[PDB]
Design a protein around this nucleic acid. Sequence first.
RNA 1: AGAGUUAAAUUAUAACUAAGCUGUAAAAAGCCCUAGUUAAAAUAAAAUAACCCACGAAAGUGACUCUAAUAAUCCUGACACACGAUAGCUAGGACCCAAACUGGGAUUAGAUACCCCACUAUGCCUAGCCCUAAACCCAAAUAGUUACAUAACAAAACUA
Lengths: 72, 86, 137, 97, 99, 122, 49
Amino acid sequence: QDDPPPSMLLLDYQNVPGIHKVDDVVKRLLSLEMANQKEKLKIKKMQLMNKVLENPEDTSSLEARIVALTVK
Amino acid sequence: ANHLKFIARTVMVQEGNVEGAYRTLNRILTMDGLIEDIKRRRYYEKPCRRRQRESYETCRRIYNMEMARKINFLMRKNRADPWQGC
Amino acid sequence: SSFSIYPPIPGQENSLRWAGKKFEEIPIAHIKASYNNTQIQVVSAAHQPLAHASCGTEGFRNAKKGTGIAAQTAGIAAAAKATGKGVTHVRVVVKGLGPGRLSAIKGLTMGGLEVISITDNTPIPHXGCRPRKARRL
Amino acid sequence: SNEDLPVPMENPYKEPLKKCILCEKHVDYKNVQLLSQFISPFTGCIYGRHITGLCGKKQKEITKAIKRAQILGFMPVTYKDPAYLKDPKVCNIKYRE
Amino acid sequence: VESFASMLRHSPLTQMGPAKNKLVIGQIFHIVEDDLYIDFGGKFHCVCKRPEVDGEKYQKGTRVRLRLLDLELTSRFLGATTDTTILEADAVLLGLQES
Amino acid sequence: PRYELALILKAMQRPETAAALKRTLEALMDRGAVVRNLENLGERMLPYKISAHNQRHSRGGYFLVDFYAPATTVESMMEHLSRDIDVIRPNIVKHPLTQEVKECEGIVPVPLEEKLYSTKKR
Amino acid sequence: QEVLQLQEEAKTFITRENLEARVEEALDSPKSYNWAITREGLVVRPQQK
RNA sequence: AGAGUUAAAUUAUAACUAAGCUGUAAAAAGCCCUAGUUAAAAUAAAAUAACCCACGAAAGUGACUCUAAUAAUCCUGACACACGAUAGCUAGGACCCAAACUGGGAUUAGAUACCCCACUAUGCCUAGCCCUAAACCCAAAUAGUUACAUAACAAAACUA
Ligand SMILES: [K+]
Ligand SMILES: [Mg+2]
Ligand SMILES: [Mg+2]
Ligand SMILES: [Mg+2]
Ligand SMILES: [Mg+2]
Ligand SMILES: [Mg+2]
Ligand SMILES: [Mg+2]
Ligand SMILES: [Mg+2]
Ligand SMILES: [Mg+2]
Ligand SMILES: [Mg+2]
Ligand SMILES: [Mg+2]
Ligand SMILES: [Mg+2]
Ligand SMILES: [Mg+2]
Ligand SMILES: [Mg+2]
Ligand SMILES: [Mg+2]
Ligand SMILES: [Mg+2]
Ligand SMILES: [Mg+2]
Ligand SMILES: [Mg+2]
Ligand SMILES: [Mg+2]
Ligand SMILES: [Mg+2]
Ligand SMILES: [Mg+2]
Ligand SMILES: [Mg+2]
Ligand SMILES: [Mg+2]
Ligand SMILES: [Mg+2]
Ligand SMILES: [Mg+2]
């Protein structure tokens, strides 16, 4: 079982630069606090494959799909 | 029960006649379908009959509105035939 | 002569006074026209009853009271009792659908009473109590 | 060698498809006036497609928007709000004859 | 010898384009008491009624002006494998030809 | 905005109306909500009499609050407003601006359908 | 782009510091969403009254 | 599948007036603790939109709001696993209204039927079971073709 930390930016609003210079207000509005269960699954799936899979960019591989089904 | 009174389903007579005003009220209900609705709520129809009634009402509305179009489309072909005894 | 079907809204101020009183001040004539009986009651603007009449009280009995003529006579009788108490105009509210709707409306007209507004308040459930089963006559 | 033969091109005379009244417009449950124009003033019923004339997308949205206002307390249920009785007529139904 | 394809390109019918809302002149070839059978050069003959003004000068061979709406009236009804033609055309009168 | 609070308040004077909004917004902030703005729709006569807290109300004021809140705290906000007596009817809906107006092209005409029966001589 | 507009929108959010000011301002500036539609599809704003 | 919510009708109940009220092709029985109007919880059911044809594997679902959410990088497959309207059973709670059974009235040669009046199981909520339907679109799943060609009828014919 996994537990995504609450105060983390959602999947989309991570790689964009200049986040840590923003005030706590916007960081609160983008964290998992103001995101529904759907955004939580993305973070679970993103972390899970990066720990077990070898090549994360491959989605058609059987191992990648097994990880995806396990999250569901 | 909670709404204001004498606003809904209300008409006012003009020039002192009441038969004309009443017929206006009936056309209001018939167009909105309340008159037939009250008729069908006197007794209860099972959902089996309700769908069988909506499959006969819809079919009639298709045939009638299609035969109506053909009549209007062919209506112009009713003038006196110019080639009588040709 | 611009005439509007819709009633004068109480919130506004419409200069349309019958017999010196406003629209809401005019008494009410409730008509419950069922499939077997027709009951007519006239009430004041404060919902205080003035006179009551029905096909049963006018001598009609059993099946006879459900006919149109019985409702027509009830309208005449109710208007006469109402006119005795001094009412000229009345707003008639029709309740239910039955054979006595037309007769009762013109019954008040020929009984010495004048109507200005017609309202239909038939009980229309929006989904409500389940009605009785069908009749396999 | 013959250049007079027709070319396989799409029809250039395709007139643009008809737009519904509320096309590209955002319906809402807060503007009673927009929702009130599609309700019969005497009874309070909601007109169908054959009377309203709206498309298949803005007819369901109007229906859902109206019913949301019925319960949330923004418009009357059994009659049209008399304040919006003088708005321009968009429906194609005539009661007076 | 002119190829048939070249004939269609320069034909007046092709240059007309869509038949809706086109001002086309025609000639009357048959007269009834109230119906004027007008030939406008199309496949069929359109029928129009005599106007109340200058109605006495609408005679056989007279040229009039038309506004074509449908070149040939034809519609499809349910249960019909083939459309039922009317063998006529739809047009309206804008007056008589100004010679 | 993410959530919209369709708030209806009992008709009263300026001081208590401000106090009612002040504590209602305070309750929202306690649950972890960042309110964007407050919109006033004025006082209007209610469409129908609404029974709330053993009272019959015919006139009330309309107010609208939009905020970002976690999904699990919606029930607490609804439950809190139910116990309050100065609010006649609270309702929470997702903000209509969250969804985008889907692009439309036109009313595509549906041709009449053929080949619904056999071609035998009827 | 999405986070940039939230950066600007964060300035006007209601905080406990300006809870009174926003409430007082709201009670003095009524606004309505009502607008009608014509047959041709043009928007009619009742604010012209 | 959960949580919260109620517009129209109806009833307990109160006030006022009236002597009758319900019911049928026609009546009787029942009621008179009643009927009409005004004020009004709970329970139950979801007008118009729907002349739309969407979601689910099927049975099913169309009052409002929020939360969770609709397998497979996209073949076939049982006696195995999971599900399955309505009626019925076990335990608790609810009961407006409808209503098998039962009693009364009428009809009839008889009517333990059709028609009228009263009321119960039950239809409802929570937990468990039962696993049956004209569960029928009487047309099995996946890919396709419009070629060949009309038993009849129906919803045209066919290949892997
Ligand atoms: K409903
Ligand atoms: Mg109610
Ligand atoms: Mg449940
Ligand atoms: Mg007796
Ligand atoms: Mg009573
Ligand atoms: Mg009780
Ligand atoms: Mg369906
Ligand atoms: Mg499947
Ligand atoms: Mg699927
Ligand atoms: Mg399989
Ligand atoms: Mg079962
Ligand atoms: Mg059951
Ligand atoms: Mg059961
Ligand atoms: Mg047993
Ligand atoms: Mg039990
Ligand atoms: Mg019971
Ligand atoms: Mg009962
Ligand atoms: Mg018996
Ligand atoms: Mg079935
Ligand atoms: Mg079978
Ligand atoms: Mg099958
Ligand atoms: Mg199979
Ligand atoms: Mg499959
Ligand atoms: Mg197939
Ligand atoms: Mg044969």
